[PDB]
Amino acid sequence: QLVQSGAEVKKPGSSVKVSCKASGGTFNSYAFSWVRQAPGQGLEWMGSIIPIFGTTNYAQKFQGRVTITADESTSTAYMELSSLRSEDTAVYYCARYFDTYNNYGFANWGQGTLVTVSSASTKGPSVFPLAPSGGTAALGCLVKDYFPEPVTVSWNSGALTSGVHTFPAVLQSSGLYSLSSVVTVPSSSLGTQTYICNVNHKPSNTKVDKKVEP
Amino acid sequence: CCGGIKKEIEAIKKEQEAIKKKIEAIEKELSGIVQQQNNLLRAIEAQQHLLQLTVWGIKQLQARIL
Amino acid sequence: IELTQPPSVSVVPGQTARISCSGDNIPYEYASWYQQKPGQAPVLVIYGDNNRPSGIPERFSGSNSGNTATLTISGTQAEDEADYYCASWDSMTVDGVFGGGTKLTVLGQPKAAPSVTLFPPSSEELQANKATLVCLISDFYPGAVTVAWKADSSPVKAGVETTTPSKQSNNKYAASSYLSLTPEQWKSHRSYSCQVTHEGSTVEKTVAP
């Protein structure tokens, strides 16, 4: 239903748009809001737009800095915040209301967009394959000192899914992150199938693949 | 007794078959209404929604002022 | 307009749970409640006059009384342990407004022990002037986690780094510990342990160079 633009990195004082595509349904019937969340914090509401008139209203905190627009032709809402500062680093959500007439609630949400406002520098991951050998067996990938968040790992271009544990990132002293992602499998399917590790770090425009086997 | 069955069966059977299809026609028009009755409901619910949508729309504009 | 919740609320498995949203210039049909599990968008659970969206379990009800919204869960569950938010709209400004959130805690609880695993250095990384080892503590309860790495036989602390624990979908925590190092010190000492204590036990894993 709602899907948003990918994660970004912005220099302080600069700006950023964020987009949200509302799939399948009448765009003129929608009402939309942006809601951001700082890491380990509450949700904070920013603004609303009603596409069919394009009438917006914003929270005073952000008035002046934020614009919200919509494009009916493409079924898309946009928010754009300017004069960025560190406290703006947040996950930004896009939410639909007026699912029905009496429903002032946000019935549908975006997947979120992480926006990071640091001054330098974007860094690409170091994707590594791991060493493998009815019971238990597990292989995976390693992503080394990159920056910043987040980082994506999927297996076989989207195929292999069950019993997969992707792990959270350590932030190093260096100011770079690393994380870890493995797949649990029984002994009876090892060196036969194919096993791709697809990694995307969108901010560095890094998209990488990686294979694994005993 | 009989003799007058000649004048009755061949009389109030036809008019009582003039019912066994002048009812078998209505049962279309009843559901010819539920056809319409339901579209109407569908129509109102569409407006009702646009209304809430426009009220807000006005509240937002009004808010932009004063 | 501003909303007010108890910063956390804890409860026994199978009880009535009550978060209160309070203040100030009232809602009512504007008020909404949301559940957010770690790393997920909020999911609307209650809206307006005690209304559940589709596919929402009946244990959830919305209460109201003047200044106050109250979400109420009957017979709580482990899966109901989440962060909850109330939201409403200021009738004057039409601004949206959220409460500060409430961590519903059902902390106890059915304990499970940390499953620890250790990958050897990436052989392709050995090629690349490095060889970090990858330890995967996971599936534990409580989030209590405290680890000791080890080379050959001698105690180790410096050179590594670790992550704080974080709740899974299965509500059991997880962690990760690495040891970046030189692609020669690893093929010098033999196997490497991983002393992961969960306040009683200590779980290792050992890989052969």
Name the nearest CA neighbour of A198 among A144, A158, A138, A154: A154
Task: Check residue B50 and report its DSSP letter.
Answer: H
C145 plus C184 within the same structural domain:
yes
Token pair of C179, please? 């040891």
Non-local (6+) Cβ contacts of C165 within 8 A are C140, C143, C144, C145, C173, C174, C175
Residue A8's domain is classified under what CATH number?
A: 2.60.40.10
B 35-64 near C (Cβ less than 8 A): 56, 59-60, 63
Contact (CB<8Å) B60/C92: no
A14 plus A108 within the same structural domain:
yes
- C131 to chain A: nearest residue by CA? A128
Q: Which of B51, B53, B64 sits opposite A50 (nearest CB)?
A: B53
Helices (H), chain C: 123-126
A148 plus A78 within the same structural domain:
no
Token pair 């209404």 is found at B33
Q: Choose the final residue of a domain: C83, C108, C133.
A: C108
E-assigned strand segments in chain C: 8-10, 17-22, 32-36, 43-47, 60-65, 68-73, 83-89, 96-98, 102-105, 118-119, 133-135, 138-140, 146-151, 154-155, 161-162, 173-174, 177-179, 192-197, 202-203
Contact partners for chain C, using 3 or more CB pairs closer than 8 A, are A, B
A 92-111 near B (Cβ less than 8 A): 98, 100-102
- Grouping H, G, I as helix, E, B as strand and the rest as coil, residue C23 is coil
* Chain C residue numbers touching A169 (CB-CB < 8 A): 163
d(CA A66, CA A17): 10
* Chain B residue numbers touching A56 (CB-CB < 8 A): 60
- What total of structural domains would you count in chain B? 1
A60 plus A151 within the same structural domain:
no
Contact (CB<8Å) C29/A105: no
Instruction: Give yes or no for a contact between A197 and A127, defined as CB atoms under 8 angstroms apart.
Output: yes
A104 plus A127 within the same structural domain:
no
Q: Which domain holds residue A5?
A: 1-119
Contacts of B19-27 with C-beta under 8 Å, sequence gap 24+, read: none
Q: Which domain holds residue C124?
A: 109-209
Q: Choose the final residue of a domain: C51, C82, C108.
A: C108
Q: Which domain holds residue B61?
A: 1-66
A137 plus A158 within the same structural domain:
yes
* Chain B residue numbers touching A102 (CB-CB < 8 A): 52
C115 plus C91 within the same structural domain:
no
Task: Check residue B36 and report its DSSP letter.
Answer: H
Non-local (6+) Cβ contacts of A41 within 8 A are none
Q: Please state how this structure was obtained.
A: X-ray
* Chain B residue numbers touching C94 (CB-CB < 8 A): 56, 59-60, 63
